[PDB]
Amino acid sequence: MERKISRIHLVSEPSITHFLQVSWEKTLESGFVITLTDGHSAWTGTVSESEISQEADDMAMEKGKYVGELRKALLSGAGPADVYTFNFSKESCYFFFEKNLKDVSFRLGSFNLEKVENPAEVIRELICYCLDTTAENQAKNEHLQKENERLLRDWNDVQGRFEKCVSAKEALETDLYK
Amino acid sequence: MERKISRIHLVSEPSITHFLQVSWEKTLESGFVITLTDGHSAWTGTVSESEISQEADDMAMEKGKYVGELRKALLSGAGPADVYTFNFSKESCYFFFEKNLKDVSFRLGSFNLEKVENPAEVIRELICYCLDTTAENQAKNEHLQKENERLLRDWNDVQGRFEKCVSAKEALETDLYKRFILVLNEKKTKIRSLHNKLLNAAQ
Amino acid sequence: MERKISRIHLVSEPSITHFLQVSWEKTLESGFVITLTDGHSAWTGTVSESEISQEADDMAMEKGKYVGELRKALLSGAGPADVYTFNFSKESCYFFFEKNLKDVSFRLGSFNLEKVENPAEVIRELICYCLDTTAENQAKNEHLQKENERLLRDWNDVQGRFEKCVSAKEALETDLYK
Amino acid sequence: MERKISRIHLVSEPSITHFLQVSWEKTLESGFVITLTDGHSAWTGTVSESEISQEADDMAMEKGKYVGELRKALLSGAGPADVYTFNFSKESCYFFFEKNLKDVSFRLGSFNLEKVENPAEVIRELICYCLDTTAENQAKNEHLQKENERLLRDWNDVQGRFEKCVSAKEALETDLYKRFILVLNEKKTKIRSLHNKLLNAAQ
């Protein structure tokens, strides 16, 4: 399974940074689970692959394009120009996000999130994930430097073999064969 | 500032995974702030450079070795055989940790942690910090990657330019050589044209 | 425009008191200008609202919290416990301030200050500002006392009206109506 | 000690604003120290109680009125119609000021000012002094403010307690009154019960 964690700002609470954890199986369009967090409370919701496909229809868009918008808006895939906003009512339990073109905004999606009974468990899980992840990427990068390091020392060996070659030549002619 | 995050298990709470966030400026030896979390509440404390030197003396251990111990116990820098344990009284807010040696554990250090009034902000700050870290590292990957692909190309085409130089010089030289041979010959062809027609011109 | 003038002590010159003049338009986070003075020389620098927001990020803090720290440290908003220190190199032109928690200090900010070509003009301006200000606050307080004074004399009138009321009563019954 | 700061304009330097800092102990009449500044350099001098009395006599002016003039000219206590001028020779260090009367200015006083070796400290001291003043005054505001809010409440609830007293007494009294009326009646109801059944008991 795959996930993406990102930070957003709710239109109703601009002084605080909320977080988004979105996870899916093979593809985002195959359906995904979405969790919103403020670091203490947690709200989760599910979106089936049929609700997605259905929404793309209601919007006169090709499923691919819509999914694309979903990536940009929910998996932090937005471009420098793209501007997305997010809304959530901690009473309504209704979460909706919009795209803004020149200040003219249009609904892009919306779903209901239910309050998580055990938020600290979700959060602990999120941190473990990040921990494992940072560790993996640390390794990869560490292993990648060993490789670059090898290339350099591996190259330094060629230098030496070359010098020894020249000397063998600047010699052999002048000597051995006279 | 430097910052390190890791998971630990409290002796009194073996079922719930706790997190430790250590922040410091230059070396751990200069002091450092330490935060503990269960993802719901947060406790923070500070350990000064003095307290660190004091503790190290109380164990008759040279600072270096001690700072190293703090590094292993508190920054996940512990070896596979290293057994460190952590203790925290949520009523006392006294936190001490010990290194297990010869089946017996010895207190390696301690400190007090005030309860954090606003845990959420602390957790938020941690996730913010992780996001930056994940993003920062991913980029270093991609940069190291290209730097890697770069080196690999300079190699793949060095033995390319090299084989060409030789051919070049291998050519200029052969001319230079064939010439000299020609010179050696002319100096002998004139000798015959003469010595023969010279014994004709002279005698 | 708003400003705040305060006194600090540079780690490198503890025997002398330096001064800080910080000014901003609507908000501190909207960007501000900072001037350091020793009463003779002057060093000024600017901080845009984007450098601020940027710094809060690098520090894993919410813009609001960071700005808060800036107020406490640069506009003398520190609490009794808070301890901030300030550094400046009159060669490096580099100014940096740190917060100290139990003697363990952490960088909080830093910027470059350029030497002011006409320090006495800045200083004269600062004094005019203080002058105007002291005058305003003098007025306000002076006007506020006239008000308190009015209330007291205004109240003394009620006393008299009351006495005249009683007398009218202790009379009317005993007299007029007999 | 008392201290007053103000801006003035020197006749010889109409473009640069200068500052005057006057310090004294009880009354200006007891002597006082005066400092002049352009924010770069500083000149200081002292004017004794004697010199002040001497000058006042040299003008056949009663001390009181003269001290008042010094107050207006040197402590910003000058009226809207008052025109005072100031003169300073940075080469002589002689400073004299005059009051403009009937289109002609008359010297009101003078004194010498030695150049201050360390101007910065003087300026620093002034800003330090202003900081204290701004802080001290702001506090008096806040204190006067509360003292104000206080008085306003005692009023808003006095007409409250008052309306209640009346109701209280307005009640106790009505009982006290209704009783007496009852007494007056009983003294007449007995009269009838008797006089009628008494003319029956007697006759």
CATH of the domain at A5: 2.170.210.10
What is the Cα–Cα distance from D87 to D71, expressed in whole angstroms? 17
Q: Rounded to the nearest 5°, which phi and psi values hold at C90?
A: -80, 25
Strands B31-37 and D2-10: unpaired
**Cα separation values, B2 from B22, B30, B31, C86, Å:** 8, 12, 12, 21
Query: How many angstroms separate the CA atoms of D75 and D22, rounded?
Result: 7
**Closest-CA residue to B28 (of B9, B7, B47, B54):** B47
Asked if A6 and B131 come within 8 Å (Cβ–Cβ), the reply is yes
**Residue D97 — φ and ψ, nearest 5°?**
-135, 145
The angle, 0 to 180 degrees and rounded to 10, between the axes of the packed helices B49-57 and B63-74 is 110
What's the first-to-final CA gap in chain A, in angstroms?
A: 74
- A47 and A100, same structural domain? yes
B194 occurs within a structural domain: no
C-alpha C48: how far from chain center: 21
Domain termination site, one of D91, D118, D145: D118
The pair of structure tokens assigned to B61 is 């251990």
Contact B23 C102 (CB under 8 A): no
Considering the domain architecture, whether residues D123 and D139 belong to the same structural domain is answered as: yes
| CATH code for the domain in which residue A137 is found | 1.20.5.370
The DSSP 8-state label assigned to residue B13 in this structure reads E
Cβ(D21)–Cβ(D8) below 8 Å = no
Hey, are the CB atoms on A17 and C64 less than 8 Å from each other?
Answer: no
Number of residues that make up chain C: 178
Whether B128 sits inside 8 A of C103 (CB atoms) is no
Spatial distance between the Cα atoms of D48 and D109, rounded to a whole number of angstroms: 13
> Is the same domain home to C76 and C139?
no
Residue in the block written with tokens 């494992």 = A132
Helix (H, G, I), strand (E, B) or coil at C54: helix
DSSP classification of residue B113: -
Over the range C107-145, which residues count as b (16 or more CB within 10 Å of their CB) and which as e?
Answer: ebbeeebeebeebbbbbbebbeebbebbeebeebbeebe
Q: How far apart are CA D201 and CA D203, in angstroms?
A: 6
Is residue B71 within 8 A of residue B28, CB to CB? The reply is yes
Host domain of residue B140: 119-174
Q: Quick check: B30 and C104 CB within 8 A?
A: yes
Query: Rounded to whole angstroms, how far apart are CA atoms A107 and C43?
Result: 51
Q: Are B67 and B29 in contact (CB under 8 A)?
A: yes
Residue of B nearest to C61 (CA): B125
Residue D191 lies in a domain: no
Joined together, the tokens standing for residue B40 give 């719901």
B42 inside domain: yes
- The secondary structure element, H or E, covering residue A22 is strand A18-24
The closest CB to that of C148, out of D131, D133, D148, belongs to D148
Kindly state whether residues A89 and A131 are assigned to the same domain.
no
Resolution in A: 2.7
Contact C104 B50 (CB under 8 A): no
DSSP A145: H
**Cβ-contact B124, C62 below 8 angstroms:** yes
Q: Which of C9, C107, C83, C97 is nearest to C45 (CA)?
A: C97
With contact defined as beta carbons under 8 Å apart, do D171 and D164 qualify? Answer: no
Helices D119-156 & D158-201 angle (0-180, nearest 10) = 20
State whether D114 and D17 are in the same domain. yes
Specify if B77 maps to a domain. yes
3-state secondary structure of D16: strand
Q: Is B23 helix (H, G, I), strand (E, B) or coil?
A: strand
Q: The tokens of D42 are what?
A: 């500083």
Query: Are C25 and C40 members of one domain?
Result: yes
Neighbours of D199 (CB within 10 A): 9
Relative orientation angle of helices D119-156 and C119-172, to the nearest 10 degrees: 20
Q: Verify that A47 and A69 share a domain, yes or no.
A: yes
Say which of D119, D133, D151 has its CB closest to residue C40.
D119
Domain boundary among B96, B118, B140: B118
Domains held by chain A: number: 2
If you ran DSSP here, which 8-state letter would residue B98 be given?
E
Three-class DSSP category at A35: strand
User: Which residues of C are less than 8 Å from D145 in CB distance?
Assistant: 144
Q: Do residues B66 and B102 share a domain? A: yes
Query: Sheet containing C104-112: which strands, arranged edge to edge?
Result: C84-88, C94-101, C104-112
Chain B contact partners (≥3 CB pairs within 8 A): A, C
Question: From its phi and psi, is residue D130 left (phi > 0), alpha (psi between -120 and 50) or beta?
Answer: alpha
Residues of A in contact with B126 (CB under 8 A): 127
Q: In this structure, how many other beta carbons lie within 10 angstroms of the beta carbon of residue D135?
A: 10
With an 8 Å CB cutoff and a minimum of 3 pairs, decide whether chains D and B touch. Answer: no
Residues A62 and A147 in one domain: no
- Residue D190 placed within a domain: no
Cβ burial, residue D139 (10 Å; 0-12/13-18/19+)? exposed
State the residue for tokens 């991609």: B142
The β-bridge partners of B43 are B36, B115
Of all residues in chain A, the one with the smallest CA distance to C65 is A15
- The DSSP bridge pattern shows strands B42-48 and B94-101 to be unpaired
Same domain, C75 and C149: no
For A137-144, the CB contacts below 8 A with 24+ separation are A137/B134, A137/B137, A137/B138, A137/B141, A138/B137, A140/B141, A141/B137, A141/B140, A141/B141, A141/B144, A144/B141, A144/B144, A144/B145, A144/B148
Q: How far apart are CA D24 and CA C55, in angstroms?
A: 49
Nearest to C38 by CA among C74, C78, C90: C90
Residues D89 and D168 in one domain: no
| Cβ neighbours around A65 below 10 Å, total | 12
How are strands ordered across the β-sheet holding B2-10? B104-112, B94-101, B84-88, B2-10, B13-24, B31-37, B42-48, B114-115
Segment (H or E) for D131: helix D119-156
> A103 with A47, same domain?
yes
DSSP state of A41: -
For residues A150 and A144, give the distance between their C-alpha atoms in angstroms, rounded to a whole number: 10
In the sheet with A94-101, reading across from the earlier edge strand, the strands are A84-88, A94-101, A104-112
Last residue of a domain, one of A118, A151, A168: A118
Is residue B105 in a domain?
A: yes
